Design a protein around this ligand. Structure first.
Ligand code: GDP
Ligand code: GDP
Ligand code: IMP
Ligand code: IMP
Ligand code: HDA
Ligand code: HDA
Ligand code: MG
Ligand code: MG
Lengths: 431, 431
């Protein structure tokens, strides 16, 4: 299809970046529709590594225009820092990035807040990346946030910033008894780039409508994961953006009816960073294996990720919220070595009742235990294999099982961090 | 199609209620996916009038189950008040309504806040319905709000309410220097219905997936209007929910790929309640005519609505954000009498530049003037006409023009408040 969405079916860090990058070989635009610089993606090409956050994953391809749609909480300071490292590597970021004037802005008071808020929680810490995503979203919904389009008029901008920072400074010093953020520092910083940012402004809603009428290929790049969805994730341990396929329409401006293929990324094994319900979590040696072996460390915070067995019951959730068309099984290779592996197939509720549907709010996952289905592993290596044949029977079986239990076909298998260590069994675009 | 969405293409009050009600004759479920009790709909049957707010518009039909999906900010006090008036009229509300445990709750501190916040703005008042929608949404996104599922555990509930109300009470008394909301009053009220509410809890995401696999007819009822969209409307004069087709996926749990027909409601003339950019606004006698004649008064606040000419340029916006399949022209009758009528076809920017695309943020509509296209009116009456033939040439011409200028067919024409004063030129469901 012309419009392909790529998102996480779990808690993020499944491997969107790699997949989107490899896939935009035939794409005209790549659109980021939610989150902010809390996302940490990792593309690896000829062993050269690039870790993006705010910038869409197609930025290294010169035949694609990267757009950050109105659903992204944009941080100028963060953007620039990113823009420069990329431009230093011979990547003309400003030649290829466009963005929406409707993007809220993440300024220092937000980060100030985010940390203060988090600290207040203590034992209840959500375990946020601490980028001010939450507050940026609050001001947004609470109709007081400043947007990219507010840089077009600086005097006006000064007035507005003035009444928002003070409101914020108040609760910061008075309630949190933390340090106030300086209005003049923020004003000076923001004003030093205002022009850089406004030069890249475009009307993304309309751009996408044209791209569409013209039949152009468009790819939407999701951040975080399904179970991090503000509405549908393990509340309150979720990000503040709709990570699910639905963010595509609210965050880009495209009507839902023009979404062709929803490619859910699948990591063959599960990770989670931050506080939150994680049924299949491994606290033992295998947990360590998966982690050591999968180099599981926050691409943004560098913090270790909790790891465990593949939770099919939860994945089945992702399939329905997202209306997935297909899957992309990432990190099948990390499984090489295990004597046997297991995947969760049902949940044993704390009242002895066996259920195959996930609970909604965090609190309801409390006594939930997973009922596994154990399978024989495989010693044969699969790293870098780019063709089904090279995959041992154990591997293809696990794979079909996943499909069986979910009812969604695996369309791409990732077997290495490098862009080419892959097998495209079906290309989203010509489908 | 099996899944039909019905929403406002303008600023709300176009006539969703009437249309949804008439349309659920063949529908199994009706789902409200956004907003709260700020919406004021008006169904009229055999002259009997019902004005709903929180309760979906299919409630009077006994063959349809009404569901308020997770995207709705639900007020218990408000729900009950509504539930009772309906049940008193011989409508078994609890026999037919289900809702999501994931609905945030609108309690008194929210209303307290909403008014305080609004007052602080003074001249900048958004002109909100004053129901606490905004704050309810803030707590939501800011991961501190209480949800329907939090009534399942009252001791726990007491703890949480405690830490949220105090945070709120603080800014209420200290910052706004307004009155604090009593924790015990709120706790007692909420606890007196907790059971009533929890008995109606269902897992809407899954319900819709079943309904879908089963081919059942589902209708999604939108509140407010497109241009009130938090992301895409005239920020900051917007509601805090995504009013656009996209709310359907984030607010119900249905994957965007399962949306079949998006029916945009169209009011043949334009109204707006609240502060906000309104290019075609009439401040003269015709303005008064449209208003008097269209009984244009806030169905929720009883406040008069600003009225004007049909803004096609803005409607064209609705078409693309929403990926509309068809239109439903409401209130064609109010036009009867006018010597001639006009519709806006382009915008004259304050720099002399003629443009056919709408500006995003409120501030950018500031010096925008509309370029009309005047048409001959019609004295012949159209009230209650239920067949094209009864429509004078002036009427059918205006109609085709609207289609011409938009590229979307008018599928239903409304010509009276009563459920039967209508013409279904194409039924969304068998399309
Ligand atoms: N072994 C292995 N590593 C992979 C594979 N796909 C991606 N990676 C790497 O795994 C990580 C994927 O997580 P992250 O960078 O957070 O991806 P995100 O989902 O886009 O954030 C990065 O370390 C990628 O380079 C794969 O199939 N095998
Ligand atoms: N004259 C006339 N009134 C209508 C028509 N359709 C709906 N109404 C009435 O117009 C109003 C529609 O606005 P509202 O009740 O806010 O509908 P909403 O969009 O669902 O909120 C109510 O007064 C309806 O009964 C129509 O074609 N003609
Ligand atoms: O890109 C991401 N990958 C994985 N988890 C994330 C990401 N962004 C946020 N989270 C998680 O979501 C919670 C809130 O993070 P926030 O998005 O910074 O609010 C924390 O548990 C984070 O670890
Ligand atoms: O159902 C509605 N109909 C028309 N306008 C609405 C409705 N709900 C909110 N608005 C408008 O949106 C602004 C904010 O209202 P709020 O939804 O109460 O926040 C005000 O201009 C309201 O009049
Ligand atoms: O790559 C993104 N990370 O896993 C998020 C974090 O570091 O919290
Ligand atoms: O029927 C809904 N109204 O027009 C909203 C309001 O009264 O503000
Ligand atoms: Mg990551
Ligand atoms: Mg109304």
């Amino acid at each position: 299809g012309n419009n392909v969405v790529v998102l996480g079916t779990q808690w993020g860090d499944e491997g969107k970046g790699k997949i989107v990058d490899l896939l935009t070989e035939r794409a005209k635009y790549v659109v980021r529709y939610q989150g902010g610089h809390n996302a940490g993606h990792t593309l690896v090409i000829n062993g050269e590594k690039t870790v993006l956050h705010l910038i869409p994953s197609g930025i290294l391809r010169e035949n694609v225009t990267s757009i950050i749609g109105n659903g992204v909480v944009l941080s100028p300071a963060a953007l620039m820092k990113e823009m420069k490292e990329l431009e230093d590597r011979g990547i003309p970021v400003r030649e290829r990035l466009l963005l929406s004037e409707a993007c809220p802005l993440i300024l220092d008071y937000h980060v100030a807040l985010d940390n203060a808020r988090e600290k207040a929680r203590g034992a209840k810490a959500i375990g946020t990346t601490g980028r001010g995503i939450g507050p940026a979203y609050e001001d947004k919904v609470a109709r007081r946030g400043l947007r990219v389009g507010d840089l077009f008029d600086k005097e006006t901008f000064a007035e507005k910033l003035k009444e928002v920072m003070e409101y914020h400074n108040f609760q910061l010093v008075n309630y949190y008894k933390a340090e106030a953020v300086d209005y003049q520092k923020v004003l000076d910083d923001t004003m030093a780039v205002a022009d850089i940012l406004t030069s890249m402004v475009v009307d993304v809603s309309d751009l996408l409508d044209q791209a569409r009428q013209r039949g152009d290929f468009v790819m939407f790049e999701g951040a975080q994961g399904t179970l991090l969805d503000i509405d549908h994730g393990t509340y309150p341990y979720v990000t503040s953006s709709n990570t699910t396929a639905g963010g595509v329409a609210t965050g880009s401006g495209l009507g839902p009816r023009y979404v062709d293929y929803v490619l859910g990324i699948l990591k063959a094994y599960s990770t989670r960073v931050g506080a939150g319900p994680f049924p299949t979590e491994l606290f033992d040696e295998t947990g360590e294996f998966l982690c050591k072996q999968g180099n599981e460390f926050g691409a943004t915070t560098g913090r270790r990720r909790r790891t465990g067995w593949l939770d099919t019951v939860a994945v089945r959730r992702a399939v329905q919220l997202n209306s997935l068309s297909g899957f992309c099984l990432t990190k099948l290779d990390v499984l090489d070595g295990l004597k046997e592996v297991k995947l969760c197939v049902a949940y044993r509720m704390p009242d002895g009742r066996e259920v195959t549907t996930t609970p909604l709010a965090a609190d309801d996952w409390k006594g939930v235990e997973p009922i596994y289905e154990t399978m024989p592993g495989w010693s044969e290596s699969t790293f870098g294999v780019k063709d089904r044949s090279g995959l041992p029977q154990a591997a293809l079986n696990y794979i079909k099982r996943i499909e069986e239990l979910t009812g969604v076909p695996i369309d791409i298998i990732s077997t290495g961090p490098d862009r080419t260590e892959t097998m495209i069994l079906r290309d989203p675009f010509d489908a």
